Ligand binder design. Structure first.
Ligand SMILES: CCCc1cc(C2CCCCC2)c[nH]c1=O
Ligand SMILES: CCCc1cc(C2CCCCC2)c[nH]c1=O
Ligand SMILES: CCCc1cc(C2CCCCC2)c[nH]c1=O
Ligand SMILES: CCCc1cc(C2CCCCC2)c[nH]c1=O
Lengths: 546, 546
């Protein structure tokens, strides 16, 4: 019975294979068939290619030896290699054209999700080319989805030598009969088969995956669309910045490129962006996923005033100052969305671009006020319930698991009767004691939020709603301004509080505003529709944020 | 008696002044004298410029109002503005040409070092231009050297209104007679003077600084060359990555740009790079200053094998993997220098560029060994003393303050008799009980190292020297390779162990090797000659690391 799956890289997890380029170059340059492939394998286990694959020499040392083999082969074949013949150019192109075989990676992901130990076993080189970063990125994206990466040049052994197969089994801590091994080179399957492993000669992916599901008894083909990569809290880089004597800000950090600062809403965490973090880092951005003031590992002072928008914005500016960042793109959701618009209004020099999920840009009415406005719309009643210190805290802190299970639900699954929260005396007066698990969350993800809120609870988070008169006065100073920096507004169809129609007048204040819209999406945007959120943000980032 | 110094920005801390561009544009376009300056100030306190300076409107909203004032002024003067006349182009250029007035900044730095409270008081705008980042960077570099930054557009008040002066005094918590105020606009000095503050009308910097030193009694002019900006540990962003179950790695992070991973030697800290960190971040790099395994906030496992080069390198690769970095430039000193060369030899795909301070590239002799080689050269005797577990630990841990005071000394100041460490039974057998403070370090910097080594001591750090046979075997696998990625070797004249002549054969292994060399520089390169280290690294980074 199988418990391990091993994948080759070239021709299996990455396509097109580099071996197929040697053939394509012969045909294009009308060279004798197999001349390039023969110079490549010249001298078998004694040759330059084996020394390269074993880690004896680097790719740049190998290039001239391949040229000499190419010359030797052309001489024997009584032919002449062209004028502009360059091994470097051929291999540079081949490596750059090679992409992840997404359906093969998904099958490996599905196998690992069902309890399989997964590994990449590859014959590779030590790449010292000026352009090595391309391959370095490919190996990075790939390796993180597997338990083991075994590279010939790092282990000093090569496929098809029997030693590498014994090394593989040892690494996996599995007997040969419990291993499926997938390779596009028949010669490399032979020793795995001889040892008793299940082998699959990979020609086209579909057939290979049909064999893979037949042998494992797990559906890998015709599978529903997978969710994006999520985050394991313990595998992230955690950062800590003191912004003032009693205030430290915590964040999770992933990627290189322009800085993208993610700002969650109420009552959330950096972990609310778990499905965006690997995606935005992969798209070429440096992600800074915040624990906002009052949350997780960030400080949670008890004073209401500590959570007014002016103080919160000033602290985010200091946060940039202490990290040495002149700008960041600011992306917010719910309360984080309100803050990002105010970051754009008050500090446009520090904001590369601004995007909000659900939260429209709410300009202060100097004639009315937020209190009067909140009373006018029954959907905002819960904000009045949040006013009196202690009341909402007691209900939200009573049973943490019930709190997040009741809150973190899709539009259909909801248990909250938003209209009369004050009258009924609570958000969960009609919610069960043991809510069911929403289709959006696992038990483990709920438990991460539970552990996070054990430190400071709901005082600091609730205080974000207790600064209406303070925020209104501060906002009124911006009544003559406009947002003229790149901006994105993302509406959610089924958000019953932050309704799409609430954003209809935003172009008056933000004339160059770009939009995004997600159908069948509730309040918890990032986890409700992760794939579509990622697609909207990546498209807007690449076009408007550089 | 003075205790506060206030500086204006345009024409004082930054040059050339933007007001001087309006005059230069009139002369270049042969326009009537003062036309551009008059359209700029049109309507005084009621005008568009005042609304901009108070934060009522953004720079992009102001541009069209300035054009209309320019039209109105040209009409009255019975003249015509040119065809290609654009306020945006003029201001874009003016802002970009404006640089920090380095001698004025040094005087502010010297005043702050002597106990003065320093502030920037400026009439500025909310910059929403596509090119705002330039100014955002200037304000960033500048603000960090002052206690306060007061911006008109953020306080809704403007110079010369008396309210801003009362706001300034309140912020400073100082009476007017204790304040020096420097401005290039006579009209803006007037209210400060009226209140009783010492004022300086800044025309040329030299004269202004002569007045400033005459009034404060502190030497600001003709001062010795200042050291680069250092780091305050509590103001840095601290990062933590788990690289394996029992190993977490700590680092300090500053800047945006290509990742630059700094690797200290023995017995050091991330803080050994304190003079390089602000400099390299300012030069356009993302600095990652490590606490290497066994040091500071990084884990310190007790087992010798945990500190062999193979394990240490694998962990640095995982460190990159967990941060989502495909590459970093690796810069090392002493033991960190040895590791960076091995990172280049074994993982060239993950290394953008490699630089070493003092440590040459030491290729294994398959015929000899490191033990035999270490015995052959008496300067390396201390490494034999480091072999026996517990012995070096007892001496180094006995009195931490004495340890770092005895070690961290320039070549002349040294108290160690390196030749016979074993024979004499210790590194400090001829060092005083209370060593004097070296010219390179303050009491506070020594105390930071003391507090750092209180956590794990010298076991983990000493174990880096206890892997000779393990490192030799691993290194022998690389005997056929070459380092062909961008590489820099920096030698130190007065290092008595890692002597410059030890690097003389490096070109055999690294043919494209670039070099740097520092005269009158001992073992502690980074703190001995910080200005020259910064100059060598920045020059090589900008030319070879992108
Ligand atoms: C700057 C506005 C201040 C503010 C607005 C709101 C609401 C008002 C109704 C529309 C959505 C935001 C809640 N809390 C606040 O502090
Ligand atoms: C139907 C209830 C779901 C919902 C809740 C909220 C609030 C409720 C209290 C916490 C903040 C989100 C906003 N929008 C919604 O659609
Ligand atoms: C890879 C070499 C291993 C090694 C060398 C040295 C010395 C040998 C003499 C020259 C400088 C480095 C000290 N410790 C080691 O583990
Ligand atoms: C003259 C002694 C100064 C000195 C010490 C060291 C060692 C001594 C033990 C700790 C590591 C550095 C290397 N090079 C030098 O010039």
């Amino acid at each position: 019975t199988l418990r391990a799956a091993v994948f080759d890289l070239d021709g299996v997890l990455a396509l097109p294979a580099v071996f197929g380029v040697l053939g394509r170059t012969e045909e294009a340059l009308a060279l004798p068939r197999g001349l390039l492939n023969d110079a490549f394998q010249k001298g078998g286990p004694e040759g330059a290619t084996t020394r390269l694959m074993k880690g004896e020499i680097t790719l740049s040392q190998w290039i001239p030896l391949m040229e000499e083999n190419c010359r030797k082969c052309s001489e024997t074949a009584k032919v002449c290699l062209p004028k502009n013949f360059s091994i470097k150019e051929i291999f540079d192109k081949a490596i750059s054209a090679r992409k992840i075989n997404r359906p093969m990676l998904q099958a490996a992901l599905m196998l690992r999700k069902k309890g399989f130990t997964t590994a990449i076993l590859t014959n590779t080189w030590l790449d010292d080319r000026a352009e090595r970063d391309g391959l370095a990125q490919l190996m990075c994206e790939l390796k993180m989805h597997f338990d083991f990466l075994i590279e010939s040049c790092q282990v000093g052994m090569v496929k098809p030598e029997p030693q590498i197969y014994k090394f593989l089994l040892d690494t996996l801590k599995a007997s040969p009969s419990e291993v499926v091994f997938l390779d596009d080179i028949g010669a490399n399957l032979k020793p795995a088969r001889d040892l008793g492993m299940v082998t699959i000669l990979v020609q086209d992916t579909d057939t290979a995956l049909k064999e893979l599901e037949k042998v494992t008894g797990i559906q890998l083909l015709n599978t529903p669309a997978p969710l994006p990569t999520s985050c394991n809290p313990s595998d992230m880089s955690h950062g800590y910045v003191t912004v003032k004597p009693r205030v430290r800000l915590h964040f999770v950090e992933l990627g290189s490129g322009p800085a993208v600062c993610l700002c969650h809403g109420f009552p959330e965490s950096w972990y609310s962006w778990r499905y965006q973090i690997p995606a935005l880092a992969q798209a070429g951005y440096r992600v800074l996923a915040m624990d906002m003031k009052g949350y997780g590992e960030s400080s949670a002072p008890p004073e209401i005033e500590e959570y007014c928008m002016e103080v919160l914005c000033k602290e985010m500016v200091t946060f940039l100052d202490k990290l040495g960042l002149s700008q960041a793109v600011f992306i917010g959701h719910d309360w984080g969305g309100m803050l990002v618009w105010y970051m754009a209004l008050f500090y446009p020099e520090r904001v590369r671009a601004v995007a909000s999920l659900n939260t429209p840009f709410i300009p202060a009415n100097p004639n009315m006020s937020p209190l009067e406005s909140i009373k006018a719309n029954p959907v905002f009643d819960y904000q009045l319930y949040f006013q009196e210190p202690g009341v909402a805290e007691a209900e939200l802190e009573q049973n943490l698991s019930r709190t997040f299970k009741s809150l973190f639900r899709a539009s259909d699954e909801s248990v909250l009767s938003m209209h009369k929260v004050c009258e009924a005396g609570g958000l969960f007066v009609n919610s069960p004691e043991e809510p069911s698990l929403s289709r959006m969350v696992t038990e483990e993800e709920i438990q991460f939020y539970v552990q996070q809120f054990k430190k400071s609870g709901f005082r600091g988070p609730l205080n974000w709603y207790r600064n209406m008169e303070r925020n209104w006065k501060w906002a009124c100073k911006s009544l003559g301004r406009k947002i003229l920096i790149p901006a994105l507004m993302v509406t959610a169809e089924k958000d019953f509080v932050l309704v799409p129609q609430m954003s209809q007048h935003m172009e008056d204040w933000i004339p160059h505003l770009k939009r995004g819209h997600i159908e069948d999406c509730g309040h918890w945007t990032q986890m409700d529709k992760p794939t579509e959120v990622n697609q909207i943000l990546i498209k807007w980032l690449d076009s408007d944020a550089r």
